[PDB]
Each structure stands twice: as C-alpha cells, then as structure tokens.
Design a protein around this ligand. Sequence first.
Ligand SMILES: CNc1nc2c(CCNCc3ccccc3)c3nc(N)[nH]c(=O)c3cc2[nH]1
Ligand SMILES: CNc1nc2c(CCNCc3ccccc3)c3nc(N)[nH]c(=O)c3cc2[nH]1
Ligand SMILES: [Zn+2]
Ligand SMILES: [Zn+2]
Lengths: 354, 354
Amino acid sequence: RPRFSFSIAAREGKARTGTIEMKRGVIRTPAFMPVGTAATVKALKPETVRATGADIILGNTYHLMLRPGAERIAKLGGLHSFMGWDRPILTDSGGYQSEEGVTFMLSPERSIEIQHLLGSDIVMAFDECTPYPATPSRAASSMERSMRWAKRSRDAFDSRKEQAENAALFGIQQGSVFENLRQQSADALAEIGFDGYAVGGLAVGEGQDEMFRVLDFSVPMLPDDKPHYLMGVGKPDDIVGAVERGIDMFDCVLPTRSGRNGQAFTWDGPINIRNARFSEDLKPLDSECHCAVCQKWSRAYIHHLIRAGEILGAMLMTEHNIAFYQQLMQKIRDSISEGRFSQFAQDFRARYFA
Amino acid sequence: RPRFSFSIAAREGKARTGTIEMKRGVIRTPAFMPVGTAATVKALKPETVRATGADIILGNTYHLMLRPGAERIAKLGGLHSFMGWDRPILTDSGGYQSEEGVTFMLSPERSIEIQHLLGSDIVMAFDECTPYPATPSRAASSMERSMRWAKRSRDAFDSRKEQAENAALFGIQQGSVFENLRQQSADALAEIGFDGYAVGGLAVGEGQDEMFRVLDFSVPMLPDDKPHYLMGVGKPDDIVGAVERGIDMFDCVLPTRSGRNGQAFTWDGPINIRNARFSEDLKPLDSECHCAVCQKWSRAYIHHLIRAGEILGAMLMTEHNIAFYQQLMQKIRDSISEGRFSQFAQDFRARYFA
Ligand SMILES: CNc1nc2c(CCNCc3ccccc3)c3nc(N)[nH]c(=O)c3cc2[nH]1
Ligand SMILES: CNc1nc2c(CCNCc3ccccc3)c3nc(N)[nH]c(=O)c3cc2[nH]1
Ligand SMILES: [Zn+2]
Ligand SMILES: [Zn+2]
C-alpha cells in the first residue's frame, strides 16, 4: 500500500464515499474512529473493535504523554504493538499559553515528536482549540496562532524522515463560527499543504443547528480531493448531517462513554438500559443490529449488569454501541454508493426521532 | 446424558480423576469452578469462560435472590438463558437465626426453591457455616442443625419432580476442626444420601496446615464413590494439597477478584502486576501459559491498564488467572491418570515457592 492515497468512489451532493489506503491498512470512508485515550478502547479487546467493523482507531498525545509516557511506549515497540492494534491509528495532537506552546509542556514540535514516538499513522497538527462562544477578535488571534503552529507542525513532521515516509499529516481549520476566519484558515492550510483537513473548534457547545450552519460554508473551503475530518462528532444524527455536508471522518467518545453509563444506541433512538421498563425485556438492545451482543443477550440481562455495576455490562454495552456506529457508517457508505443517501438520511431521521 | 453419573477413571493415593456426566454436559474432575455471584463471571463473557477450559461455573442463592430476584430470573427463562451459559451450574445455598432458617428470609425449603427457580444443575443443601474458631459445643450444635437442614433440603428437592429428575443434590459436612463431629456429620449425610458431598466450614481462617489436617481425616469419611467438593478453596497450592487428600471439586473467588486487584498467578508464584518492576517488561504474564492473553499482551501493557483503572486490565488479568487455574486442573488430571501426580505435586511446589 502507499503511505497515503485517498480515492473517492462515489458522490451524492456534497457527500462522498471512498477509501484511504495507508501502509497499515485501508480505511473506508465515511469512517467512524473509536476513541482509545489510554491505549485502550475502553472495555474492548482490539479484536472486538475490529470485529465491529472499525478500520482505524483514535489515540491521544496528551493522555499517553502523561501515562504511560511517549518515550516508554516507543521503547516498548510503539503504540500498535503495545495495545495490540495493527491497523491505522490517528492521534490527536493535544490541542484539545505562549506562542511557543503550552505548559502544564507541549509545542508543535514536541506534539509531532510524541506522535512519532507513539508510531501514529495519521498525525494531527498541534492547534489551539478556540472556546465557544468567542468574540471575532479572539477567534482571529487563536486561528492565526493555529495556522502558525500548522506550519511548524508541517516542518517538524517533514524533518523526520521515517515519519514523513510512513505516516500522514492532517491540518486543522479553526475560526469559530465566522465565515471569513474559516476561509482564512482554509487558505492558509491549503497553502501549507496537508494529507487531510480537519474541521476543528466545533462540537464545543454551539449546538447542532449552528454546527451545521458553519459546516455548510466551511467544508467546501477545504481541498475537495483530500479527506475532511470532523473532530469530536458525534451523535448518530450529527454524523448523518455532517456527511451530507461533506465530512469523511469522525471520532467521538459517545458510543463508549455513554455505553458504560447505560445509554444504548438503536435505530429507534437511544435508550437508557437502566430504566425499570427493561428489567424483564427479553428483546436484544436493538431489533436489527447484527452485533454479537444482540445475537445473544437480552435487554433484561444487560439492565441487570449495568445496575449491578458489573464490568460485563460495560463490555456488552460498549461492543453494541460501537457496532451500531459502524453499521451506521456502512449504511451511509452503501447508500452514497447507490445514490440513495438523501433518502436514507430522511428515513433514518424519521425513525430515529419517532 | 444421565441426570448424574460420577465415574472414576484413575487413582493415585487418595487422589482421583474422572468425570461427572449431567444433562447439560460433562465435568472433568478434579474440577475448578469459576465463581459468578451476580450472574456473571466478573469481566468475562461465558464463551471466554468456556474457552479457558471451565466445564461448570458457580452461582449463588443469596446474591441472586436479592438481585435481580429468583422469580424474575425464572420468568426470564432461568439462569442459563439469562447469562448465556448452557453448561452445568452449581449454586451455593446461601449458607455462607432460628431452627426454621435465617431472616435478613432463607430456610432449607426456600433455598432449594430458589435454586430450582434459577435452574441450577447441582443444588447445595442449605447449611449453617460454623465460624472459626468454634468451641466443640457450638460446633456440635451448628453441625446438628445443619444435618437437620440437610434432611429438610433432601425432602424439598425430592418433592419437586422436575428438580429431582434433572438436577443433582449435594450435602455439606460441618463439624469445624473436630474429628468426632466430622464423622457424625458424614454419617448423617450418608444416611440421608446425596449425589455428592462437600466439605464445608473450612477456609474460614484456620490456615492451610489446619485445613489439611482436617481434610486428612474428614475426606475418607465421605462416600468414596461420590464427588468430594471443597467449598471456597483456594490458592493453587491449596488445590494441589486438597486433591492429594481426595477432593474432586473446587470453587474460589481468588482468580477473579485478585485478578482485578492486579494479582496474576504464574507457575513461578503470584505476581502483583502493578509493581513498578513490570512497567517495561515485554514478557507475557506467565512464560508457559497457553491463554490468549499471554499469547498477545505484555506485562508492561497490563501493568499500565491496571494502574490506569482500565476495564481491559480487569478483563485480561481475569482471563489469564482463570485459564491458569484450568491449566492447573488439567495438569492435575493428566498426572493422576498417568500415575505421576505425587511427582507433579512436588515439582509444582518447588517452583511455585522458589
Ligand atoms: C467533542 N468535541 C470536540 N472534540 C474536539 C477535538 C478532540 C477530538 N476527539 C479526540 C479526543 C478524545 C478524547 C479526549 C481528547 C480528544 C479537537 N481536537 C483538536 N486537536 N482540535 C479541535 O479543534 C478539536 C475540537 C473538538 N471538539
Ligand atoms: C472462602 N472460604 C469459604 N467459602 C465457603 C463457602 C462458599 C463457597 N464459595 C461460593 C461463594 C462465592 C462467593 C460468595 C459466597 C459464596 C461455603 N458455603 C456453604 N454453603 N457452606 C460452607 O461451609 C462454606 C464454607 C466456605 N469457606
Ligand atoms: Zn447490537
Ligand atoms: Zn496466560
């Protein structure tokens, strides 16, 4: 496989489906990346993560640098070997205070170095993620700093031959909710040049309507021929709408975290499995889901497990929710390839919100 | 398969190896039964429990009657269906205050009824487990009460046709550390008649030397042609010594509980994986273990997981420890069948305690 190749196989409106080829494997897009902050996707073995359909997972510069340490993981053979995942890993840069970086120490150069030490396949530029709400002045200052940091990221990555030759580098667009700042950011990133482009600074309290409004003008500012990654998104309906606006990649803690908290995603909407109405419900979590959890266990059992604080409850809820997300992405991919994504999006929503 | 058949295939001293045939499957003896108190063997899917080699698991009258409720589990199709384990289940009776029973309500009749509602394959008589130390008078009174309760258990089980026809009933010997009381108890149980006989009231603070001393005279008091179950035992070396004294069945929370606490069993002795000496140790938990955990993950990773409080840490430690216990039982079975168990016991100990 090449270091990096993104091919678009089909389109419908702003929506795209295709593949990212990398040395450690192929990524089908639109893609959902399970999050694994402490070098584990919580409560799941990697084979289970893979079984659910994930092609790529997300790791974190900030958390791993603190524990167990980036140098330590490199000494032990890198993150892939350490946690037992041999497919691509994307690492966030720790961006989610001086011009040099952030002490708490992280700078563009150290960030890129840590991602190298971890052996990340898709490296994110080190940014400043702009709080919401932000005045235009502050959003501008922060965006500008990020673009400077973007160039610094690019140069550090490029200066490390093994990294430049085997991994990919994504730039992150900032600018808050302001169209002109988003455009300046996109321009700057495109001029520097990256393997893919993320939309940063969303999903930070602005709400779906505003998020979608910003996506409406921001995603077409990015190079069309490269992947578009929406960081930190999101709920199933967020994902569908974002794909309708041209997003190809997603990460989110929702399926894992809310799973351990009793929230199960279904095609009929989320449910909270701890509610007493499930205590004698022999149906599986979701009626159509193909995952092994729904093949074998009842709502009633899982209700009991979660109420009892049992680890198997977290395990089963998490496997189910990640499988659910992967099935969602598969149905998205399939409908775009068949040119019926807009109808799928409508059908999904009618039933999810019924 | 029959309701119950115990066949002894080989012997060495007091040690025996054979099989218990029951409707839901065959149990190889000497057997280790993983404990699953809240209708789950903590942090493991049943398929994983089975993969490690378990033939039978243990469930609990006391815990399940409280949550989620025995009637409720029966309504949902029984414990096997509920938790997804289709092989034999042994249930303890809640014995671990008046002549009628125990309010907190449990009596022999209710206990046997709850085990029926759960659909247990091996039902334990409802006993009074005698605290240690006990004076002879108190041990006698408690033992006598248990024998009365033993008869009551037998009659309740026998009065329930479906139970009597498809499950088995084990009696529990009491008597503390006193030979004459143990003998009276054994006699009483044999006169009533059971499918198997447990040695109760040990492993309750007396220490290995005393436990083994009591086993020395107590196990030969039990019918030779029926299984001998030591309740609540134990550490790997406890198990070996108890088999040398004629025990065929064991249950214990140690492998699961101490696994979540960072304790890993190895042929070189237990280790505490959280100790800093493992933080960069790329060897698997145990050098010879065949389990999937040791096939794939390092001490270093698991050290990190447990230190970080990650659920995967509990999962991997628990799978390993239960596999370890099953491997122990397999080596015990094999060496007895080959007439080299005494040599195995010596070799085991030399290395485990080196
Ligand atoms: C939930 N909304 C949200 N997430 C955002 C992230 C983090 C992406 N998720 C990875 C992660 C997982 C756990 C802990 C920390 C990070 C961002 N990362 C960066 N670098 N820059 C952003 O603008 C930015 C914006 C975000 N909004
Ligand atoms: C650890 N030492 C010990 N365990 C003993 C048990 C319980 C066996 N293990 C099942 C279980 C697991 C978790 C919670 C409760 C029970 C006994 N059970 C009964 N019925 N009678 C005993 O004499 C008796 C003596 C014991 N000693
Ligand atoms: Zn499912
Ligand atoms: Zn192992």
